[PDB]
Amino acid sequence: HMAVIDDFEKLDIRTGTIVKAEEFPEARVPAIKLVIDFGTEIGIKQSSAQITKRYKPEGLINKQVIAVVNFPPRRIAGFKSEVLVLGGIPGQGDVVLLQPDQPVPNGTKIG
Amino acid sequence: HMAVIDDFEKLDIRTGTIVKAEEFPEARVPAIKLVIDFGTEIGIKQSSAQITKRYKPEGLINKQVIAVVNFPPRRIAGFKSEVLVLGGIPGQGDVVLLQPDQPVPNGTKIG
């Protein structure tokens, strides 16, 4: 139950901008396919995000989001999800996205 | 270097509301003491945050923040800092706080 700072330092947590978002009707659990620009050191990354409760694709473009970018990928229905986009989880199937409280460059590190 | 999801699962990342904010510097760097309500289970925690570049105490009260709650405490700026408040780091001495993009209850878990 207790972590150390070393646990946290293993993670590469970064800001990126949603540049594409589409409904993902092939996922078992409702999801949106995201493409996110993490700047040129990290690259442009795909994510499958179970965020259909509060969000629509037309509302996601140009949002700054927060993701762990140094995990192995997960394939769902053939789509390669490359990053874990972080959010608060107020209840089952519910997500509230995290964001920097003001704009920062893509690839800005979190600590 | 790469991480695995359970490096992430070791962390307990929670939302909380800043209920008090005071200037509490170190000798060599300014800093703010945050008193944060993480809801009824976690309770009230304190944090030393080097966030004075963009923020004043008056602009911090009532803000929902994101923090790692299950680290060992550390002594800093004359008190026990119990929680790591997360922000983007755009440059030397600069911090942009993370927030939920919409209000969530205190103690909402991040995933």
CB-nearest partner of B89 from A10, A66, A109: A109
A26, B94 Cβ separation under 8 angstroms: no
- Listing DSSP states for A46-84 in one string gives EEEE--TTT--GGGTTT-EEEEE-SSPPEEETTEEE--E
Torsion sign (Cα): B83, B89, B92, B96: negative
Quick one: tokens of B94? 């600069």
Please choose, from the candidates A110, A73, A67, the residue with its C-alpha nearest in 3D space to the C-alpha of residue B95: A110
Resolution limit in angstroms?
Answer: 2.0
**Chain B residues 5-64 with a CB less than 8 Å from chain A:** 5, 7-8, 10-13, 15, 54, 63
Cβ B31 vs Cβ B53: under 8 Å:
no
Alpha-carbon dihedral sign for residues B1, B4, B7, B9: positive
B32: its two tokens: 């703010």
Pairwise CA distance, residues B102 & B90, whole Å: 23
SS3 of B9, please?
Answer: helix
Q: What would the DSSP string read from start to end of A15-31?
A: EEEEEEEEE-TTSSS--
Smallest CA–CA distance, residue A25 to chain B, in Å, is 22
Q: Where are the beta strands (DSSP E) in chain B?
A: 13-23, 32-37, 44-49, 64-68, 74-76, 79-81, 84-85, 87-88, 96-100, 109-110
Domains and CATH numbers, chain A: 1-111 (2.40.50.140)
Q: Give the one of B7, B66, B98 whose C-beta lies nearest to A11's C-beta.
A: B7
Instruction: Tell me if B33 sits within 8 A of B61, measured CB to CB.
Output: no
Check: CB of residue A95 under 8 Å from CB of residue A51. Answer: yes
Q: Are A50 and A30 in contact (CB under 8 A)?
A: yes
Please name every residue paired with B87 in a beta bridge, in sequence order, or none if there are none.
B97
Cβ pair A93, B72 in contact under 8 A: no
Record the tokens describing residue A87, joined without a space. Answer: 């959010």
Report the distance separating Cα B45 and Cα B77, nearest Å: 15
